[PDB]
Design a protein around this ligand. Structure first.
Ligand SMILES: [Mg+2]
Length: 169
């Protein structure tokens, strides 16, 4: 519905993992994030690049046959839009989202229902599976951080659990 799309799908495949996707250059650039996003700016999550997906896949919630790529249950875990923070810079520090991605340094403000705030995706040269680091960007906070995966486990589109999606198709 709104653009540029940000979506995370929770994906019960071989193992449970999250797929993060951001719209750019007409597709959803995608990463698999084994343990999902963290709200804590000290937590580094690893983000393994996966295939580009079509824009309309952002609201796919249902079941892919076991044995296929993407096989298992897919939940639309969070969805919204994002803003590219790297456009908010003095002249000659500005970077479009595509230039950001090409450089291996993406800083965005995610406008989701579960995640809302500044997050970084940083490309690495030597983490296994062409790893990137995915983390909440540092800002003032007092207190411990919610475990968003525990606190908000269900579909942002339908409110269903993973097992309800698997049973219903
Ligand atoms: Mg997958």
């Amino acid at each position: 519905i709104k653009h540029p799309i940000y979506v995370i799908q929770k994906h019960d495949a071989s193992h449970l993992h999250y797929d993060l996707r951001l719209e750019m250059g007409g597709v959803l650039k995608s990463w698999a994030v084994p343990k999902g996003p963290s709200l804590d700016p000290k937590v580094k999550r690893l983000a393994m690049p996966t295939e580009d997906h079509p824009i309309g896949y952002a609201t796919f919630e249902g079941v892919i046959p076991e044995g296929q790529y993407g096989g298992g249950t897919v939940m639309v875990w969070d969805i919204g839009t994002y803003r590219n923070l790297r456009e908010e810079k003095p002249e000659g520090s500005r970077m479009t989202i595509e230039q950001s991605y090409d450089q291996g340094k993406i800083e965005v403000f995610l406008e989701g229902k579960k995640l809302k705030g500044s997050y970084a995706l940083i490309r690495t040269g030597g983490i296994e599976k062409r790893g990137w680091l995915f983390f909440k960007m540092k800002e003032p906070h007092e207190g411990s951080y919610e475990d968003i995966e525990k606190a908000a486990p269900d579909s942002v589109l339908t409110g269903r659990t993973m097992d309800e999606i698997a049973k219903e198709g």
